[PDB]
Design an enzyme around this catalytic site. Sequence first.
Site, short mmCIF file in Angstrom:
data_model
loop_
_atom_site.label_atom_id
_atom_site.label_comp_id
_atom_site.label_asym_id
_atom_site.label_seq_id
_atom_site.Cartn_x
_atom_site.Cartn_y
_atom_site.Cartn_z
CG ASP A 50 74.88 63.67 60.01
OD1 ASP A 50 74.45 63.04 59.35
OD2 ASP A 50 75.98 63.96 60.08
CE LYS A 80 77.20 60.51 59.52
NZ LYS A 80 77.88 61.10 58.27
CG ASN A 137 77.47 61.17 63.40
OD1 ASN A 137 78.60 61.36 63.47
ND2 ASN A 137 76.70 61.89 62.42
CG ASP A 176 78.72 65.29 63.76
OD1 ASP A 176 78.64 66.44 64.05
OD2 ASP A 176 79.19 64.82 62.81
CB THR A 194 44.70 88.65 53.46
OG1 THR A 194 44.45 88.09 52.28
CG2 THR A 194 45.82 89.67 53.27
C1 LIG Z 1 86.66 61.92 63.63
C2 LIG Z 1 87.09 61.34 65.18
C3 LIG Z 1 86.57 59.90 65.41
C4 LIG Z 1 84.92 59.49 65.62
O1 LIG Z 1 84.60 58.33 65.87
N1 LIG Z 1 87.35 59.38 66.28
C5 LIG Z 1 87.24 59.89 67.63
C6 LIG Z 1 87.80 58.97 68.57
C7 LIG Z 1 87.68 58.99 69.97
C8 LIG Z 1 86.68 59.88 70.54
N2 LIG Z 1 86.47 60.21 71.65
C9 LIG Z 1 85.47 61.33 71.24
C10 LIG Z 1 85.29 61.46 70.14
C11 LIG Z 1 84.43 62.43 69.31
C12 LIG Z 1 83.27 62.73 70.23
C13 LIG Z 1 82.15 63.74 69.51
C14 LIG Z 1 82.66 64.17 68.68
C15 LIG Z 1 81.70 65.21 67.69
O2 LIG Z 1 80.55 65.46 68.71
O3 LIG Z 1 81.63 65.63 66.72
C16 LIG Z 1 83.48 63.88 67.65
C17 LIG Z 1 84.62 62.97 68.25
N3 LIG Z 1 86.08 60.56 69.41
N4 LIG Z 1 86.07 60.55 68.06
#
Ligand SMILES: CC[C@H](CO)Nc1ccc2ncc(-c3ccc(C(=O)O)cc3)n2n1
Lengths: 275, 275
Positions: A133, A135, A138, A155, A171
């Site tokens: 995934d 993109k 992510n 993600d 077979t």
């Molecule tokens: C939906 C959350 C959005 C992601 O851009 N906001 C933030 C904002 C700050 C932040 N710091 C770390 C992360 C985050 C880091 C990793 C994930 C995952 O692996 O799904 C998700 C969120 N995030 N996520």
Amino acid sequence: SMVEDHYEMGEELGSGQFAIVRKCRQKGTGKEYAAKFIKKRRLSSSRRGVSREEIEREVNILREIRHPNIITLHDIFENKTDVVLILELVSGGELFDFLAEKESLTEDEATQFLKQILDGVHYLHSKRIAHFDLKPENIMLLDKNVPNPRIKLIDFGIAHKIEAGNNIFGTPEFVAPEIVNYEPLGLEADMWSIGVITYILLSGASPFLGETKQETLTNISAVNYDFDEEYFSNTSELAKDFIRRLLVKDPKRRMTIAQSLEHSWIKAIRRRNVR
Amino acid sequence: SMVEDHYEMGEELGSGQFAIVRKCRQKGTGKEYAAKFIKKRRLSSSRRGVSREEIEREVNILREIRHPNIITLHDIFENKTDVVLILELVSGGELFDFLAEKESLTEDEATQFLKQILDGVHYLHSKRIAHFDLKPENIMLLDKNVPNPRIKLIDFGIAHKIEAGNNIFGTPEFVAPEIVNYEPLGLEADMWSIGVITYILLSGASPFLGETKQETLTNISAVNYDFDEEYFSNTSELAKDFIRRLLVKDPKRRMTIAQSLEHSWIKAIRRRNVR
Ligand SMILES: CC[C@H](CO)Nc1ccc2ncc(-c3ccc(C(=O)O)cc3)n2n1
Ligand SMILES: CC[C@H](CO)Nc1ccc2ncc(-c3ccc(C(=O)O)cc3)n2n1
């Protein structure tokens, strides 16, 4: 004593189908983190939430991986309803946001991001992990207000270990055609995604996007795209070659991550960007 | 004390790529069993033997399943080199052997076997288990010298649980075509195999077999077969319809196990065969 009690939850950062991310603070150290709440499926037979096996898949992958351009898992807990991943807080937004502000990137700007993405994927692929995934949403930035921002892949929700695997001794006489023609999903899918990311970074244009989701899927399957002169009139032949060698229907004919890193467009000596 | 020490190993019954089956006797009860020795893979990175995960997959499936037409796992042990499955001893040979002796079966004889195979597969499919290697060699007889022999399905070496599964919520813009067009292997593959088993039981002829393994694979993919008059001149239209409705390229258009059991050829009232 309870790990859950060591974190003070704060505001929502964002939400998806299966997960809500909240800002949080570790009570003792005062350090902030992102807390990803994954809603647990309630019965094996349910079609809602995330199954135990799917949660363990993501958490096991996050635990194995350690690389500067890959998000770090700090801690984990579980309560009645959710498994909560405590992740490194990254405050510079997504590459999605960055690109939307810039409209498009120059080749020097694009390659500064891509080198990092390629390094991170190189690492994942070395461990037989397909992200599946990739993109711009992510890919997070540590700090967006520098000329050469550092990135973190996030993600791992559908990431898988790819085994080397195929009764090749028995077979084949009774075997169904879908098995005869079976080709497992693998690391090549990420390479395709990197081609699409590259295209969009250079143009602000999505190469396969149609008016409907079905049209997009049809365009992807047919590899129906071009280098529209509206966006690519001044793009280098090397940048186009890089993308063409990734946007290939047959996964077995796509550049591998090693090949991508040795491509002339990526190898090319460039200046670090100024402010 | 050691489970291994409770069984006295005897002669070889047979061998495959990954496993040797020996006759054995439980020391205390005197009861005989079949001992399947599965050679363990030595390093994750090796391409020989069977991985821990593949052994556990088979053993977990054998442990879950309990049905009169499915082999029973009695015990298990492991030593330095092998995991040993102690299985119910079945002494009437394979359906493969039985057919080779009879040359071909009448429709009444064929359906007496098929009803049982269908019942056993119905059970497996109810538990979301695809066998994936149904063939006459993997169907054993309790006693071959009766007019209506009872059968047991064996060899769960490549059997899998099929999840219901598909980022269906996210953008598809960056997704590779192999993912766009991904269709998982599932229960339908067993239905195809049952069509091939049926064909061969009625004729002694393998429907897709070519002069080379590649030709066989090509024939399977193309669904290239017919009801050659050498064998089928007197076969019922219902028997041909049953086979046609299973030998379908598109898995989604094949009869399901429920549909197969309701087919007129199987429903038909017949006499139990005499000696
Ligand atoms: C939906 C959350 C959005 C992601 O851009 N906001 C933030 C904002 C700050 C932040 N710091 C770390 C992360 C985050 C880091 C990793 C994930 C995952 O692996 O799904 C998700 C969120 N995030 N996520
Ligand atoms: C290769 C062994 C052949 C199978 O027909 N001989 C016998 C002979 C008697 C007998 N009794 C039980 C079994 C047997 C039962 C199950 C398996 C399996 O699940 O792979 C293998 C062998 N077998 N196998």
